[PDB]
C-alpha cells in the first residue's frame, strides 16, 4: 500500500505558483508591476 502525489511524481501541483517574470525570464506578473500598470 503506497500513496503518491504530484511531488512524488516529480510533477507540478494543481495549486502551484510560478516564478515572477523578470528582464531575462518570463513568468507571472508581479504585484508591483500590476499596480504600476493600473496607476499609469
Amino acid at each position: 500500500i503506497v500513496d503518491l502525489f504530484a511531488s512524488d511524481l516529480d510533477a507540478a501541483e494543481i495549486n502551484h505558483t510560478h516564478a515572477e517574470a523578470t528582464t531575462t525570464e518570463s513568468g507571472f506578473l508581479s504585484i508591483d508591476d500590476k499596480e504600476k500598470l493600473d496607476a499609469i
Binding site: I1, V2, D3, L4
Partner: protein, 53 residues
C-alpha cells in the same frame, strides 16, 4: 492371431499426451522440472491509493 488393435484395446506401452488448459493427461517434463523447485511467494502490489484492479 490377435493383438490389441483387433480387439480394439490400448497397447501394452502407450502414451496419453500432456494435459492442456482444457484437457487432462500427463505433465510435460518441463512441468515436472518446474513444480519441484516452484516457490510460494509471488509478491506484487496489492493496492495503490485505495484502488485495486
Amino acid at each position: 492371431l490377435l493383438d490389441a488393435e483387433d480387439v480394439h484395446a490400448a497397447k501394452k506401452s502407450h502414451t496419453h499426451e500432456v494435459a492442456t488448459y482444457t484437457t487432462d493427461g500427463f505433465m510435460s517434463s518441463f512441468d515436472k522440472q518446474k513444480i519441484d523447485q516452484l516457490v510460494s511467494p509471488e509478491a506484487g502490489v496489492t493496492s495503490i491509493n485505495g484502488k485495486t484492479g
